[PDB]
UniProtKB/Swiss-Prot annotation:
Species, as recorded: Mus musculus
Residues annotated as binding Ca(2+) 2: D62, D64, D66, K68, E73
Compartments where located: Mitochondrion inner membrane
Residues of the whole record sequence present: 79 to 180 of 240
Function: Acts as a calcium sensor for mitochondrial flash (mitoflash) activation, an event characterized by stochastic bursts of superoxide production. May play a role in neuronal differentiation.
Protein name as annotated: EF-hand domain-containing protein D1
Tissue specificity statement from the Swiss-Prot or TrEMBL entry: Widely expressed. Highest expression in testis, followed by ovary, kidney, cerebrum, cerebellum, heart, liver, and spleen. In the cerebrum and cerebellum, undetectable at embryonic stages, expression increases after birth up to adult stage. In adult CNS, detected in neurons of the cerebellum, cerebrum and hippocampus formation, including dentate gyrus and Cornu Ammonis, but not in the white matter. In the testis, expressed in spermatocytes, but not in spermatogonia nor in interstitial cells. In ovary, found predominantly in mural granulosa cells and those of the cumulus oophorus.
Length: 102
């Protein structure tokens, strides 16, 4: 995976900022954000989600079907947000807006 060629619209600074926030919420340090870690992240950002809501959020970008977010799927959230590809009521749009990145 090459984030610079996959997401050339992201500055190096934004990529580093997104890596930092991925690592912040991967509490278990396994390289993924699972449902429980996303639950905690959404609470901390000020947009708590239901259990099924969190599952729907992950499913939107879960390209390898494992029910958790890899770093490349996390970046995809922000790519979709900036490209106008998330619905106005998606928990993913709340995640991107309330992350206070950019
Ligand atoms: Zn994890
Ligand atoms: Zn749950
Ligand atoms: Zn469940
Ligand atoms: Zn996944």
């Amino acid at each position: 995976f090459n984030p610079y060629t996959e997401f050339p619209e992201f500055s190096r600074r934004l990529l580093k900022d997104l890596e930092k926030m991925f690592k912040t919420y991967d509490a278990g340090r396994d390289g993924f954000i699972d449902l429980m870690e996303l639950k905690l992240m959404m609470e901390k950002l000020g947009a708590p989600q239901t259990h099924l809501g969190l599952k729907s959020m992950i499913k939107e970008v879960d390209e390898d079907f494992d029910g958790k977010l890899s770093f490349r799927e996390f970046l995809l959230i922000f790519h979709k947000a900036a490209a106008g590809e998330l619905q106005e009521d998606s928990g993913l749009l709340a995640l991107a807006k309330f992350s206070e990145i950019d």
